[model samples]
Target chain A: GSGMDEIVKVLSQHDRILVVGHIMPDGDCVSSVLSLTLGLEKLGKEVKAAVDYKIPYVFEKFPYIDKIEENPNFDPELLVVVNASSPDRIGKFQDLLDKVPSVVIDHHSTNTNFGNWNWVDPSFAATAQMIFRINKALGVEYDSNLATLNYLGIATNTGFFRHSNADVRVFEDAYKLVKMGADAHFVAKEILENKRFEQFKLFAEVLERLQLLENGKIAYSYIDYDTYLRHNCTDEDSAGFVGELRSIRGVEVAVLFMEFPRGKIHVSMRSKDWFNVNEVAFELGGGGHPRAAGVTFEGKKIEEVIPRVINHLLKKFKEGVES
Target chain B: GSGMDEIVKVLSQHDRILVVGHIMPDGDCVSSVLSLTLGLEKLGKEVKAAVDYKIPYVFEKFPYIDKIEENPNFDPELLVVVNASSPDRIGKFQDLLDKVPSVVIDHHSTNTNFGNWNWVDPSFAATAQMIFRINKALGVEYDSNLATLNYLGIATNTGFFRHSNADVRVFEDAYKLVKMGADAHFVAKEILENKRFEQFKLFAEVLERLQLLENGKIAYSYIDYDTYLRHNCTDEDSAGFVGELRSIRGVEVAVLFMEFPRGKIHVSMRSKDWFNVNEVAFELGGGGHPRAAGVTFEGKKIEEVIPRVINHLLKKFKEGVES
Candidate 1:
């Protein structure tokens, strides 16, 4: 009973299956769910998909995105979780997680293996790649739509193939998907270049107050409640600058201090090199991946939180240099 | 004889070749020159590559970059221009253009066709793709470095494969290059995400002044000389926001105005649809391709330039509808 063979058999045997991804889904999460559903539909299985929360406006036009429901009502014999590590991460889909025998198809090292049949291989760059391998084993031919979804999965999961996780095999998988009739420009435009004018307007004001420390080694920015409301921005519009901050060349670490309500500030920390943001985030009483992590400070002013976190990161940088 | 066949024949017959691209070379132009040199060198031909001036810092570490010289001391029997369309685009290399029998290899529709043996096809999305075909015809095997260069050529020329010019054949060529072991992440990082910290700091201030019009179909911004000087930005830093403005969701056209001085404004215009910006730029005494163009105003304030250009674009859009 090999993992690949067993997973393929289980997938083949299932007729009514429900698939899901984590909440506030990204392109990787959205594509993984959609591609798997489309691949199974070609196999004559009655498959349904759901993401726990609202699909972002950017991803609403993906091929199978219309078929995905929010808090969907579907009775299934099996639950398939792709690109989502834990059942809790699936949010309201936990409604199905407990009642049904579940299988997890994922690519996160921290995956909890909370499935009756788990296929969690972090070595795979993305859950999309894992789904590609699964569909290949099941003898499903990819069309433009399915291949586009699969290609988007790998492309976005690897930060448009710029992250350290992108390797030769990742590129090979992308090549195969493109050969299978994937729309590369469509995927690139929708995911990478789909920011709205209003969203950019919000980004400009937030980025205007950006700060740098230690000769640009550390970069940071903040968005307090007043600034957020002044721009008439939603929660999604007010965040995500951490990715931009971390992309600055020669900056080891980047942080975004977002004050959702002036207090109860949420801090996002990201690192590009060997510096471990998870350790610093954990020290701050929150946890995430090594390169990316987060924490929350309640009953604290945004101005105070910024300097304290900056001081913590500076001390860590000093420790890193010494050790 | 077929065009490809004769172009290959000319290169095979020549021993001392000099390759050059347009001044202020881009990734497609740079890689076209590099990959061709490496391929010819594999056949034991003594070749030299030059761009007119300095290689951008972002492309400094590319393979064979050290081999590229500026106005080098070499006598050439044949001048092979990979991405340079006009003889004048070669700058000082024009010193040798008249002395040598030249072959123009380009993908620009506006090509001047000044070469003794001209081969210009705008159908090829990138000059890199043409070089890939040329090397394959010549039986030059691609190693990792060569493949990476060719891949960068296509990816950059097509705006990472989001531009209208990218077609299935472009992706097919990309697949072949990756199959030969091209580095996708390195290219994406160096080209897309390699902005320096100070550069981003400058971008933030400029972006803060972004403007939207005509229900967000047009997005534009300007960098005045005072802002440019205050941020201590180089010419490279002062430019490139046009891409960001163009990427706004639903934006069909974008423009960037740079007040190089109080009375002179240099403008960059880009379009996503059938609005030919080259025509507009030409009307304003500038030049470029249909989708992208540039213009310079000798003695006009940035404010006057913005309103007049916006009015011109609005008129053009109305003309587009009426016709």
Candidate 2:
């Protein structure tokens, strides 16, 4: 059974729509909520974009972000869940879902279809694409504001349209978006080109500490709280630092442990088709895409966590090598 | 009779073909040289990518960059020019063109057509597109390195396929390049996203001294030597800082005056639909496109230069606004 039309119909039935996305909002999540909110607003409905966290500065250029409500409990007739399936995953706004008739819109394989109205289009690159389609179905013509946001959503989710899910259709949608005056170059520059300087300074610190394992087949780096504090960097800066080390030609797996503000050491893992860190992360109360994954250690020091993960990975590697 | 094919044939005839692009190279110039080099290399011929200046850090990831010659006088039977259409545009390698059989390939409408063999295809999005087709005519299949650089040429020249000249053929080449492992996201991140910390500090300084025209149609900003010394940013890092300001809403023109070493300022100018600063740059002994242009002012303080240029742009803005 398809839920897209039903979700759109429900959206039409409501006058005020509070479109909210998942926690730790990335491109896809932010886009999904903003696209729906903008579509509703275009149709003369009072729409508000709600979220759990502040949208990253890179996403600030997105059109509807200025209209976003970071902390209002908008008691709307309908609650839309974008890229978030569970209650706890919704972060601070978990309770608001219970207070209203909710709709879940997503494409994750783990989606449980928990909301009253569910529209999950896994065939699409992202839930935002579906929301964008709904906007078109509602007769909202593409404009500069929505086009930029939709492009951002699609651009980011597909990793600038590079990932496996990036089909010709993605580019087709992107083409139409650009025609509507979305400056593709600047949008790409803002999202994919720009990085904070402090992050690199922080990365330099991590790179200096990278320890080679198994003769450069694997490399691991650690970022302690003191190291982060000294550089005035944050946990967010550590998000993609491991990916850089993973890109070295000889390296199999690149690992970095970052001390979070919550006294938990955040362990990020990356590989070039060698280790499935996702499974490893799942074993340690976290999960992510196969190529990249992370977990937080509650009471482990850098000395303790590094060796434990390395031993497990080393055993896997030896098994891989011997076989 | 068009010399484009003859140039290609002559280029193929040589066992070692060295292709050189312009200095302070952009996506078009860099990609054109690399694309032509890759095309020749696929034929089992020795090829080199040469330039008078060092390759920008953003473009350093291209493998062929290692083969780039800086002010080297290596003799070649044939010299192919991708973005160079005039003697001066050849950058520091102007003297070398005299030593070899030269083919000047370009898409600039303003091209002087200065090479022994010249082809100007303004129909193409960038000079790189012409180079790719020329490679195909030589019966060479796509090389991963060539595809990536060609894609860069098109992406950068057309503002990632959003510029006025962007064609379906551009996307055709881009689509194929993506299949050849040109990770568009990564490329975008490297060229547009991955910026150094010193660059941002430079941007912050520019923002602090930002100026708006009386009518607010033109905006101007500059950074002098003291600021550059304090921030540790070189002229190379200040590449696209002023271009960003030109893109602001309601702005028809944007200008940046960056003071380089030895009492000179490198001025970059960008204009939207309403103005043509290229004419102004040409008048001032600089050259570039209508939407973008640059000039160098010697022995003048930014304060002395800023108002003089602002007044000129204001005159043009009035004409553009009226029209």
Candidate 3:
């Protein structure tokens, strides 16, 4: 069978479907699962969406968001994993892969072909984009809810259409989605412009305490427990500010050390160009991809965790530049 | 004759062309002047773009920016005001309209028909967008430079496709421009992602000192001269932060009070929805649109300026809401 035929055959043959997303779920993953499930449900198939982690505040505003179960117990004829590059990304849900007939739909270039039948096309910028293609092949018509969710996913993953991966097709998709009744401002407002007063205050404080070292090569910021309480915010409220640090001109790497009220220091890092942040994260017993990574520190102040990470990143930058 | 014929006929009769922009020039105006000038120059006509004010730092990364003269000495047979809404917007160049056969091409709904020929269409989001349409009528082929500037104008004016005015056509235009070698990432990088370290520092300091009053209905931030010097930034470096304050949830109005290194205080304000900020500004010797406005204070300390402005805005909000 052709790729489209296979996808249709797999989805067509299965009445009960479990659509799952990866751990540390982002707007893309959530959008992928919900959109695909909605498309499947519209086909009169029994479907449910599930993710292991809590949905980020930015992506929480959706029609059927409340319906997304945390580790749903549905026994499905087909297990469709969307946006996860590999089984490990699915966390505890990885166990179902062995028992269930699986089909993986994703758009990551580094996606491992772990599913029984994999449809991995990295040419598209977002998995939701791939889902858009998938839905068209599966005989799903574009509707208001479907188009809006799809647009949200793509816009969020592409940094609201500012990323390099946002090609001509991406813009065309957005245009099509909007024409199909996807409220563009609603998505932008919910994800991009939506900020609580407390979260904003926390963001401002973190920014105020930002430090530049090695003549602006390394940018650092940390949030203590008292400061978090002062702003009346949760740990992840302003955690998104880490990326803003890397956006500074000539700042190759940005590291943010955040202290938890429950006694843990989480170190997040982002690299502007090509330096590997994953190695530094992994060395500290944490793991993530090359450009972005994070590690949780035990039994240490945020101040103590900062120097070692800074030195390592500085050394790496020095070595990499010289080479 | 058709609208196309009128444009073509006007251009055919003219040899020397002077393209002008508004006084407080935005990305749309700069892009309009540059793109239209390039389009006209392709027809083998003598053309030069000029603006009375300094181009914002964000828009300085264009190809032929140096060619844009600050009040150029050249006298042209035709004065083509690209993005100005009316004669007054052209500042000192408003005088040229009487002497030169002028065409005012703009997209402001309130645009006055103050030219020999006025091509005002608020249906389009940006004047640069109108330029794109006009260029198509004038038989100008799409080139890298033309498409990039045109895309920048639309993107900037529509708040990078997030604004409500960004309809299907705007996205379609962006798609066309990108496909025509607009270098989408380059535009995004230079305009959206580009930030100086000093600018970032100033922004952080301003944010850190942000004040919320009346249950977060009003947001305020002020940057003193010492703070500016500490960050090593110019007055307009992080002046755009007033809008960020408005982005806070439940914040109906946001204000930024600034102290110049020499003397005087600059007050900038933004309203989230239907609030008329221009009245407040105009009442204090400044003026702008309903959603955004500013007023400068003289012979008063920054401390002395705050209470009066805040109280006035608060009273206005209270009165308006009650009525």
Candidate 4:
């Protein structure tokens, strides 16, 4: 069984399907579950969307979001992982994976082929693209919303097609998804445009204070407890400010440090083009993508932590480029 | 006269009052009109909000926005200018200034004294604050939405309290506005946290092309027609790009050059604490505030424009540093 035949064989015999997605859910994760749930429902199969946690409350505008089971105790006959890899990363509901037959669909290069019927393609940008092909293979109608939802999965996975992961194939999948009924503009706006007022307040304050370091090659800023108090920013609110800091050109490394109340300093570092900040992040027991990475320090002030991180970054930069 | 006496006079005598905001409506302008409209309507007065062009339609989440009369031909005994300066700047509806007993409520220093009752206080950060004060004087109760709307006016105009506009009086107004019902957290999120995909796309691309000039005193970026087409950015869509450049500390001037269909270029210049870019704009037959200014040029690329403006900015920088 190749592509669609395998999908048909798995889905036809499985009367009850539990579609699952990754945790700390974003548009792609939410869309994967919703699209899969809808697609399977069309085939007269009992589908349950068991996400790790619900989307943040603000996105209640999304339909069926309220009904999606979260941290569920039960397992279905066929547990279909729409966008998951290893069991540990399946979020809170990893316990259920052991009780049922699993079908893994993912786009992670490092994904362990843990599914009984795995469909993993690291070359593709998103899991929904595979889901779209599966839908088309199963002769699903490819309804507009589902297609649009699939497009959102691609859109988020690729960071609106700006990331290195994206290619023309992602856009082709996106085009088909839009033609089916995903309002391209609406979906893009919904996913990317949402920002908290506290975030912008923090952005304005942080950006206004963006200081150039090491003769302007390294630009950095840190918001302390006073800044959080002045602008009324919460602990969890400064999510994307590091990305903005990283986006600045002429800067090899941009770091936004925040001093939390509990004697902890959280550092998010981003680098551009040839410079990768993962070396610094990994050295500090923090790791992420090549361009983006983070580290946390306990019982440290920014005055102590910034200098150390800068030293680590400087050493990493010298070593990386020289090597 | 006292605020209450003035408000009482208008509320008792005026039934059909036409409320008008400034030419280019901002968050403050929209909020000012809506807050006042809600207050006046609650007092049993027939109030109508009139503006030149409608709100960008992105703010459809705002209530009473439907009551906005776009250049509607209507008669009223009272024409209340919410944030406009003079009759000439009122677009076509400036006729209301002549035909009715006009009252100008503004915060612009250059506002012409055309209104019989002019409450133009430059100290007020936003005209919405003025509206809030008048609502207070009228003993009008504002709901959460109205409070949020008014808070947006103050928050945005004051640059979320980071800009110089966040005077003591602005916070004093904020104190009551927040107490009245505004969710400080939510409003901050609404205006600051979110951005459309096009905005983020434009942000990443423009930021990627940013340049440091004038020995790191100034930073610049430009978008040609081709870049716009590639990014799917329209002339109408490019807002707040230069502001991002200016956000850097030690960068006194931020310039964004936009190439139009013709050989013309739309140039926007933003300045920090030192230089007066408004004077520069006035020299080019365009005008704006002291910190922010914009002008248009014909038959000149950014290369030519950059040096000339940089030369003038250089002089201003030297003069300011010495002074």
Candidate 5:
């Protein structure tokens, strides 16, 4: 039997299910949880979905966005974690884990399999892909809202299917969802195109001062405290800017440094291919995937952090090539 | 019988096939022709893929890039046109249609059935997508090169799968190609990231001069003769700059004006949804899709052409809203 069969069996045994995703939830995280909750509710189960963080404006266009509770009061007997690799990734929801049987459904290769019944397939492009299968097995009725959530989850996690993780199955699943009336253009406009005006201004400033290091193989840019204040933007608003830096033709590594007002510098890192950015982030007390990673620095100036990061990354690139 | 079956039967009767894409070939056009030629050759048929235009730097990294002939010398029993809407779109090769049993396999809704066996499905996100199915039906062995070309075609035609035409089948097909070892990250890097330094400078200049019109509902930007000279870039280098203008949030209509050295102003226009850019372009003596279109004006200054185009777009947007 496939993982979907087992997941459906486990889900059917429980009456009340509490669904949670990772903290600072992205499109995949939100859509996976929402898709599951709605599917379960359709099956006559008591389902409640919650995230530790508030939803961003980009994801607000998703159907049933309001169903995702920031502080849910439901005491569920079965806890379903979607997309979070570990219990701690659900933030304060870790406390509830000890008292209930849990299921973990995720797509991260680094997933810890920290649930009673874990179905973690890194080969699956997005957690939503797995959920799409489960929805099929459970016989959940199709509708635009269901289709939209699944599509958004897939689109965001795969970077609109541009990421390496995207396989033919991802597209196949997307096709089924679209046939059910999920509008790809509408979802793209809401998630990818909907940006705050302040964010655009901030991007213009950062891109204007974009610098290249190590023979232009590494591209770096920054947003200073003054510029952030001038634009009235925050770290949340600058989401995906580093990905843009990495999109430059020959850049192997791209770094975005943001100086916060509270004695910290938020750094977003991305690697094009073969560069292990997670190692770089780990050295700086942060961790993420090899292609995309992040770390926080202790109130470092732009000049100090940039060169140091570039040197380390350049060394890594050279090492990867030599090996 | 499926279209793939019919296509295969048509190819079986011919020892040599001439495959051509549209003039001013984009990624989809080049990739579709390459994909079909390679697949047909694998089935023991001699094939020649030709494009009247030169391949862009972005797709040069694709396999067998040099195989595409700008002006090929071939007399084939059959002609296959991929992604071209009409016989004339085959450029100089249009003359050969009368002497050959031609087939048209395209994904454009506006395709004029100009072939003996026309398989025009606007529902298909990319012509390469249809080619993928044909490859399967032909029982051609899967390889990285095949996957790469198919992936590139889909990625480009779908705007990396962000365009409206991109549906679930796009991702489903992408998954299969990746499973056959088509590297999504590599394809993306070659197609999306391969840019010239001059292009970056050109983008910077155009972005710096960006203007908001129609209360920011319309975003307009322009590049003059001097700015183009300063960046040392050509019209080809700035092909997708108008897309950047449309990507800005809240902008329903985006316009890019290029003052050509040939005493003409090239106008590129884009719309998010609802607004018909084709109508605008037709009225201005050009024609394209509903969402994207182009026009040319006689030796107009950047200042003169920009406002005129913006005003026209704003009027269209207002008309769309009112209607």
Candidate 6:
């Protein structure tokens, strides 16, 4: 609670601020940074928003999305990070933590609290909800821009209000923002429903290759180098693919092996409420929450890497069963 | 809003009531009826819920879903229809409206107001939301069972709070329901994410046959009787498939043609803003909203139906272009 007032106080003193979110920017991360930027601007502050990752194509229709700079040139009075669990998650922007006075606003329970002032509330569904509170404390009136962006953050973070973390508070905040002129349907259409044909074309091919493991408790699929080019999709297009795989009736864990540019294959893992795929990813030099996680295997073929990863996952499932 | 009080008064007059929803019941239809059934039962009223269609497999997990009679045998003093825009939508139960005092609760702007006591509010995102108000008006406190069923109605009707009709009150109602132990995530998972493997398999085959017309302004696909049998999926499984097709970038309209068991080819259509698919479906002997609509081509082959429908839709698009 003290972190809220202190972060607001520090933010009020700054004339120029730079807001940034994590790499591989999702709707929550991107919207949080943009919402905070809009809120601060409305309070008569000069704000520059940046993200370490390229904005997904589906989100280009979002309001004022062009404001998000890749490498903002402006120096900030304070560097505020939203939704990033750790400095390292910001990729190229991690060096700024040492040089600039900073605040961290996040909903991740595992936040390291590395900032000079951190307002990390695991109870909050998304960092955007925290920003909504900060703006309310500053007495900035809601506008359509701020409301839409914040709503996007909350909607995405909660998987459009389906994630387990979503509680009554999430809907309460959504109610307030929508009343302030946020078009829920417009945001949902642009962010959640928009898809390129290549995205489906990609799914058609990759999904046909789906394999089941450990008596169908695990559903696994791979996108090889050729198929990646054949469909012409990026890592972003495959955003919800693994989750879709997990949605199958009996699948407890869903894994996708994507061959990134060059020979590196990125491994994304997702599990149901009880199974912890994070342990598997952590053992392979990556980390994330229990339900979702990832790792990168450099210079490896998906055929070679998938079986090995599946074996490791099978072993973990066996442990989970025995326990 | 005054309809709330009147509907409650009418319900109070009837000790034995029958609640029904439309055929091919979606979450909104089924849940709204079930929620009202539970609320009435709690009020010491005898309630029998019926649906002409079998409940979707995904919705079988809902509390007291077994209470839904395929065809009710008992007569009732009052007949209540939830989420049905017209009396005919209730299938065989339409005859009951003539014999009994009736109340209709719905959110569709297109509702026909067939009931004696009609509470039709296009502004209320879902009929379940109306049920929520009815319960509150009747002084019935929330129980987990009622809350969950009502939440399912609201969530499904609003596309999990992402649809255009979803406004501040939608989230506000969802918030109250969750606080009353609705379990937002659980309802979402059971209603939305629960997909059978056959559903994906059906998509794989149908999607590969995707066709684009009018320079990618329209996207269309079809599933033949053989493919339907091979995948072993019901009409319910393909509920949102056309919407998925419409999500593709640059595609203003999307269409799906699925062959039914009895030689009827059902045609589902979806369009984005500015494209009225209902007009197209209406021309083909179907009716629906501006954004989504459907019709059936009796005794027609998918191969024969696809081109004629595409040509008709193309003319509509051309007309849309000129206007």
Return the top candidate by lDDT: 6
Predicted complexes: DockQ each: 0.51, 0.12, 0.61, 0.02, 0.53, 0.72
Docking class for model 6 is medium
lDDT of 6 at A21: 89
Give the candidates in order of DockQ, highest first: 6, 3, 5, 1, 2, 4
Superior by DockQ: candidate 3 or candidate 4:
3
Better of 4 and 6 by TM-score: 6
Candidate 2, residues A20-76: lDDT per residue as tens digits?
A: 788778888887787787778889998777787877777776665777677875668
Arrange candidates by TM-score, highest first: which order?
6, 1, 5, 3, 2, 4
True contacts kept of 1: 0.58
lDDT of 6 by residue, A177-263 (tens): 888988888888887667876787788766789898778888999887788777777777777888888888877899999887768
How much is the lDDT of residue A244 in candidate 5? 80
- Which residues of candidate 5, in runs, are more than 4 Å off? A1-10, A85-104, A109-121, A137-139, A298-308, B1-16, B76-81, B85-105, B109-123, B129-142, B168-176, B179-181, B296-308
lDDT of 5: 0.82
- iRMSD (Å), candidate 5: 2.4
Q: How close is candidate 3 to the true structure, as a TM-score?
A: 0.85
Local distance difference test, per candidate?
0.81, 0.73, 0.80, 0.70, 0.82, 0.84
The predicted structure with the larger lDDT, 1 or 4, is 1
Each candidate structure's TM-score, on Cα atoms with residue i matched to residue i, is 0.89, 0.65, 0.85, 0.49, 0.87, 0.93
> Candidate 5 chain A vs. true chain A: TM-score?
0.89
Candidate 4 segments exceeding 4 Å error:
A1-323, B1-12, B71-73, B86-89, B114-116, B224-230, B234-236, B258-267, B282-288, B294-308
Stretches off by above 4 angstroms in model 3 are A1-5, A71-73, A110-112, A200-215, A222-235, A257-323, B1-9, B86-91, B197-214, B221-235, B257-323
Q: Which lDDT tens digits does candidate 1 get at residues B1-323?
A: 12777899999999999988878788988889999999999999999998887888878767878878876788889999988867777898877766889888888766787777777787898889889989989999999999999898998887766676767787677767877888876787677656775676677776678888888888888888888788776566754678777777888889998886666788999887667898888787777778888888888888799999888888897787688
**What digit string (tens of lDDT, one per residue) describes model 2 on residues B36-119?**
777787788877778888778777777667767776656677777778757776676777667877778888766787777788
